[PDB]
Amino acid sequence: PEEERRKWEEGRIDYMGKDAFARIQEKLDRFL
Amino acid sequence: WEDEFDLENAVLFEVAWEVANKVGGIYTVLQTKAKVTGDEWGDNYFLVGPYTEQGVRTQVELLEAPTPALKRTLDSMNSKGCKVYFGRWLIEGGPLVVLLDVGASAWALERWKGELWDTCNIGVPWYDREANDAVLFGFLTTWFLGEFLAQSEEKPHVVAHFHEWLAGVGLCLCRARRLPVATIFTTHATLLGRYLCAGAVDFYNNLENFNVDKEAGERQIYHRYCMERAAAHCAHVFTTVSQITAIEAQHLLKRKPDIVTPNGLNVKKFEFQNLHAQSKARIQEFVRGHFYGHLDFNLDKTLYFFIAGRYEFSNKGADVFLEALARLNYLLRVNGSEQTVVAFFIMPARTNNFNVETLKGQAVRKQLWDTANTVKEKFGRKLYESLLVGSLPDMNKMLDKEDFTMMKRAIFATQRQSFPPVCTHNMLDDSSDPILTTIRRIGLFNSSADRVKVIFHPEFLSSTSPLLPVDYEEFVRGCHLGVFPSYYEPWGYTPAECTVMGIPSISTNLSGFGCFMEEHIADPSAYGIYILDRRFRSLDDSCSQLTSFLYSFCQQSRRQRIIQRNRTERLSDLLDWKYLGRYYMSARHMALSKAFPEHFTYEP
């Protein structure tokens, strides 16, 4: 499931899409 | 503070990309804070940073590490594919620095990026060299901290203080490996703030109506914003250099800072009226040279205002200063006030060389001065001889024909038809310059009718400049007022230098220094600090208020001006690191309390 990490490269990121910062905060808070 | 706190085995690492690498204003912050941090942490104070050939070659004295755990850490990391340097930073305090070569560890970057995906959900593009260097630096710092904790025979308490987003990915990694480390994050400027304020869409008015992800995607800096937000979220303690940047961080980074840690200075008595008198005399000489053939105004009633710093027209508020200068010129002309105001714009730009009129004026002033000294010296010699003989001198005969000839040469030198130039240099872009465009639009051409003269010096003041061979220090010591009506200024180092030097200044409540002085002083204007209300006023109202400030300063007498300057010289005790280091102390204490609640307790 590394497809989103491919999008993270080259600045082809959907800011409000699947790679939103809510999931980033969720994954950060889980391992905190 | 003189708090009783336990730091017997605690070690502090201050991670910053600017350690021995001058690429910003944080370099001076770390350099000046190193002394007061050392005077509290002893040899347990380290400064992680990046390896640069120039920085090491001019500033870092490489040493041998003083603790066996430190040798073991350095040796393991050097034999495990990296190159780490240990040295002493040649500043006050001589703090020990752990420099890391980010390039020499680039071979793992791809794999390291995978790690950044597996713990933080943060991705970085290949073309962002700055962000990739930040990722390498953060991974190197996290590995260094982990190895230092591993090699310690007795495990100490580590306080890692990361500065800015460049060093914050290390904080994100430290929090993602359960390292026993108390992490502090300090932001000296929010990342999206510069871009949003540069948009001129009422950045401060719409702080609660921004789509941070959308704006980052528009600017293609989404990865940088994400990593700074992750650093702010993960930190045990989040601090900021100002209350205005604290609001910016609350609305953009979505976290309210725990403490505000203002930047300080190593005030050293850099009195203040001998230096002011000498510098004012040299500024008067420069103004005499520049305006030769047009010195129709009283120089004893001339007030020297100045603005300095990076050449950012909107951010530094130079347009507001120019509009207020035009309004003040009208106010001085209508009211018939014989006061003159010379406004200096010390803002470096892209210039070819010195203007011909300006060099000619300086040469003319030098020639007049030499002529006056020669005639004065021989007149004094003849006068002394006549007095010794016992006769009242006849002034119709004490000037020989040589004196008349050389004075006539001086008079012919001073003849001039054109007006003094606004700019002292030749601007490569006369049309593209905002300052010159605004000056020619508002009508400040240094004419005789104008009560406000404008001198734009687009170069750093140095003692090697043929025009004005005095540095920034000594030049601005002789000015009456500094006007810094900035719009986006997270702390503001030019107003702080101005206040430490004893000069009254005009700042705003949208700058960190302005907020600091506003909250620390009952009546700031009494002490020489004038704070514009740029946060709750339209730009026209800001210009009107600045005009009122400038006119009130002009209407002051010499007595009131001297009293106000004395109060400003008093003010400099607030800006030292002796007082302002207690905020960093408090931040470190909360970090220790949060990370190690069993061993450390904090009372706010």
From Swiss-Prot, chain A:
Cell compartments where the protein resides: Cytoplasm; Nucleus
Signal peptide region: none
Tissue-specific expression: Detected in liver (at protein level). Expressed preferentially in liver, heart, and pancreas.
Oligomer status and interactors: Homodimer, tightly complexed to glycogen synthase.
Family: Belongs to the glycosyltransferase 8 family. Glycogenin subfamily.
Function noted in UniProt: Glycogenin participates in the glycogen biosynthetic process along with glycogen synthase and glycogen branching enzyme. It catalyzes the formation of a short alpha (1,4)-glucosyl chain covalently attached via a glucose 1-O-tyrosyl linkage to internal tyrosine residues and these chains act as primers for the elongation reaction catalyzed by glycogen synthase.
Name by which UniProt lists this protein: Glycogenin-2
Origin species: Homo sapiens
From Swiss-Prot, chain B:
Gene: GYS1
Gene Ontology CC: cytoplasm; cytosol; inclusion body; membrane
Coiled coil: none
Top-level taxon of origin: Eukaryota
Phylogenetic classification of the source organism: Eukaryota, Metazoa, Chordata, Craniata, Vertebrata
Tissue expression per record: Expressed in skeletal muscle and most other cell types where glycogen is present.
Reactions listed under catalytic activity: [(1->4)-alpha-D-glucosyl](n) + UDP-alpha-D-glucose = [(1->4)-alpha-D-glucosyl](n+1) + UDP + H(+)
Biochemical pathway: Glycan biosynthesis; glycogen biosynthesis
UniProt disease link: Muscle glycogen storage disease 0: Metabolic disorder characterized by fasting hypoglycemia presenting in infancy or early childhood. The role of muscle glycogen is to provide critical energy during bursts of activity and sustained muscle work.
Protein name as annotated: Glycogen [starch] synthase, muscle
Modified residues (Phosphoserine): S391
Keyword Glycosyltransferase: yes
Entire protein: shown range: 18 to 625 of 737
Organism listed in the record: Homo sapiens
EC class name: transferase
